[model samples]
Target: EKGFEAGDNKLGGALNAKHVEKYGDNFKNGMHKPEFHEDGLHKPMEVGGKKFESGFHYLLECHELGGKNASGGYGGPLCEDPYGSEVQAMTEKLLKEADSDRTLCFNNFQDPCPQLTKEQVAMCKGFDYGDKTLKLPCGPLPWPAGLPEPGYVPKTNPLHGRWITVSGGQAAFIKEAIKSGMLGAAEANKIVADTDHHQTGGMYLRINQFGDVCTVDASVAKFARAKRTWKSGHYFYEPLVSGGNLLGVWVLPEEYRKIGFFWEMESGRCFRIERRAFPVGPYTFMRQATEVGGKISFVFYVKVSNDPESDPIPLQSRDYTALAGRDNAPTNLGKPYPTLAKDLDYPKKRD
Candidate 1:
């Protein structure tokens, strides 16, 4: 309601990183209060009904003000030139420091991928970036458990962009029932609906590739944010204002951190955040997919749901398992890896 009193313009929260160090103390006079604090400008209170956990977004805006609005008719965190550069650098510093222990996250904005191993360095070359074969594993191959004979049948596979599975359809349900003749009719039909339900548990599952084998284990997995860019048109997911949609739940090293919560607008630039977080409970991973090389190879995203009310359904599972963070028994996770899609034309090259 009451945005901020006229000239109550001083920004909020902790300040003074090295960016402001270069400038004299009087730099505050140069930047206007970010419009977010403008009178009645509708500064939303929370994300997914959760209060902004890390006041970092607003703090970034407070660092500098008066850049053009990005996406929709609103503005973002930095001003032009020296100010923008300074705030941008400041944002980088805080992001890394917060996660310095490297226990939970790898600041999505600063570093979007994981550190590579020598083995990963070689195997990753198989990526179909430019004029290469389309052989790929989710992120990188886990400890390859190859055997002379392909004994383990692959259970998990991507059947569609919507996270649909091979056995999720009615036909597969029927085929399995008839083949077994053990499952009853009532139970048979139920599994079909469960399969077709498009539940979050099935869509955003985890994985482990058994070295050189086509076998993948999705029984409870963890994933890194897939390396995806918005230019690929994966921005198709209905945009929800960060104010209303998500809570600060995770910090995946994905590109969306710099992309901001709004759509890409003409001459677009907005408040890009470095401490990117999503709500699915603490330590929860947002199930975002990357469509590479103009191909919609993977589209399992985390925005909206079929529910009439909820935006993101947090009940994600690995494969068709019971639940993600479950028991010490009947285990399936083995050095889980992040699932990524095929490369964009493999690389930015002319076909």
Candidate 2:
């Protein structure tokens, strides 16, 4: 009987080996285990329950500002919470009123945030207001003690910063002028490829086709016109004045070559562009043209001070050769105004 049992055990071992070969090493650990619960469901065994509270109570708690069961608090009933519930009700009423009539009012606040009066509403639609109505949508009412006021209308121009003068549309004109061979290919290539021309420091040169020159004084902002008797390749240096003051130098030839440039100066509490297209304000350039007087010369004139819709301002032309040229540039050319020093010995001091 013992020998027969030993043979049976050997047979069992062979069968177990076959099972491992078919199912791999994890066969004993997982293959025979049940994947589902006895009820065939996971956690929170019940099917239907209040997943979230419904109705005005839910809405009230959702909008309530400060409370144990408001915005960031535990999701529980606002039981016996009078003040919190009051705030919720007030805000709800206000929102509903705003939705229906687009206006707001409250007994506690002094000013009832008024809607645009019918008159003001008509004015907004390009109505030539023969007269004035209640000041248009005068900002919000003073906020409640604990609440912050909403942002009102912006009071400043959106374009008040240092923006690029050359619009994207204008850049195409510059590129096309070069591609069409209207401008000298070499000159265009130099303008496009050169980066050094934008340097503001140093004496700017104005050279004619014959190599006669006028020098621009950066410090004094003046230009000394070269005398005709000067040698063909001679240079004359002088201060160029635009508005009785030295033209603040912004030697950005690339920018000048593109859209032109201007300099702004701040004084007292205000700022203005001291020099622009034609050495003055409200000037606009007409077009570039070649002057046929004596020798072929290129020149463009900008109308000065005239209304944009009026006839162009009288042409104030300078020699085309009067292009921006420079030498001995300033050290702090492109840098911003130096920051003022802070009071060093405040609150505590050293001997």
Candidate 3:
């Protein structure tokens, strides 16, 4: 670090002067004559849509929305139960030590939960997606309901796939969804950061039918029905947009806390990932099979156009073979849908 005499060096003087502007003479005098910053970051702060007495306080209450952190700083499954509050949850004396030592500034916090860590998948206790059975996987990695599901076809798909679409993927709702769900401060900030510059695809708050409110990056029903069932326990990442070379589909641990987030590279390039029970295909197929007590022989392939000016897709197909297996049993992965090619508008050649 370079020494700065306000009157002797313009650069140091300017740097020190700006610090003094926000923190008063305390920053200018350093900790030897250390003066603390007050009234702003040290004062009331807003983070992840909650108003906190300070940035320090904002971090303590991540439990209200059920984030991955709160295990550290305060520690434990603070959401299901909660960390005890004592009178000593006071300010960091390190702030004074750093300022006095003229080394660092702890005013702004670097969000501790940015990276998708193993600890995330391991700590399955307090997530919002649980039942009376405490349905959380006892160990690390996510487990499917009854059986596994199919994977996306031909590496990636051209057909966008069908889904219970919602109107919340727009600009206003992206911000709204990030605030309402289990998204951590780092993920939300990263999403807003990308939207601040690049205007590629943003995450969606899907109706998700019977599933939890999850981050569905792209089409959900593009999976191919066959022997290719997803049977791993690692994180899977999907690009934020259709076009990107950075992060393609990287498989994450199957046993993970069901959540998703969109983050960008340091160069401002964006990418995303999501956690779903039926990570490979849509949940509709699984639900249908479960309700009927067996595999479905066929699906009522109905695709209605949301736009009144355009007619809905008129193609209809079936997978009579999946249910035709021995003992009238359904495929382990349930009734198989044809590839994206067969499910898409097949008969029509309209431009």
Candidate 4:
């Protein structure tokens, strides 16, 4: 049947054909060789007389033009040239000849797929001229590893309300957990305790409030939920003193919510509190809820990147249409989040 797997295998077969035509049987050996005219600067080889300036730039451009695999981010599939079908086939054949079980001609983590023979797998392992064969595996491929267990993983929560320290591995995981229904709001709060420095020197704390509950009504709420109970009033705790403090917040709509943050207080080392948020449906019904659970729960990935000059701008600072809102909703657009925009010389309200 022409299912997802069949289509992908067919594509792999087609790609092999093109790969062979461009650079001969052994393309990798000649792939890096920059073609230079008799009296020209070193440049990437071009089809006609037109040539790119820098080899590196040319390579990047070529990869981009080649499509899908060009823009490298995370661990997505590598792009194969649609025009390189023969080459791909030849490469596949070579891999099968060498070690059939180890061949990896098709895309990883994609729907349409191809499964090579056991000998082909061995061939694929032998094909690695570079040491980048770590992605391959024995038997069938396993799921990605190092993911925290299904429960709540605590992080720092920003109490001062300043948007800081948002971004990175831990933060990303929290966001994913919310979307995937792995974590909750109350659980998010329990993960971390508040500290004295607030945004400056204090540690992040997770707390449930009206801001977090209203989110449940939003579309994104399905992806998030409150971690636990809400504590309003004044809360106190020790702060991380050494490095810059950052707060990470994630909201799951019906499931749960989570909050936590970190800083390098003592020896300038970074730390985090693993907490989650609780259900806010009750608060949503009673209050004018502004926070969105799944639709707009702010999944923050906070971190202290090095000096202020080099640090990544907090997510709150980079206001997207969703965060700021359109005409009718509360507009965070046009203006930076109120906290940072207040001091700016620009106009506050969105036109």
lDDT, candidate 1, 135-190, per-residue tens:
22223222111101112232332211111121112233334444553444345335
TM-score of each: 0.19, 0.14, 0.19, 0.16
C-alpha RMSD by candidate, in order? 25.0, 38.1, 24.7, 27.8
Tell me model 4's lDDT, rounded to 2 decimals.
Answer: 0.22
Clashes of 4: 120
lDDT of 2 by residue, 164-229 (tens): 111111223333443454444344434322211111111111111111111111111111111111
| Per-model lDDT | 0.22, 0.19, 0.22, 0.22
Q: Pick out the ten consecutive residues of candidate 4 with the lowest summed lDDT.
A: 215-224
Q: What TM-score does model 2 achieve against the real structure?
A: 0.14
What shift in Å separates residue 119 of candidate 1 from its native position after superposition?
Answer: 5.3
Off by over 4 Å in 1: 1-128, 131-133, 137-140, 143-274, 277-351
lDDT of 1: 0.22
Distance from true location, Cα of 331 in model 3, Å: 36
Q: Model 3, residue 322: displacement in angstroms? A: 38
List model 4 lDDT by residue over 1-351, tens digit each. Answer: 110011122211111224223432222221222343333222234533445443223332332211111122111121122124443353344324433222111111111212235553453343221211122222211111111222332233222111121211122332333344333334433322211122111111122233332111110001011111212110111212111222212222223333222222222222222223221211110000111111111122121111111111111211111112222211112222122111111222220
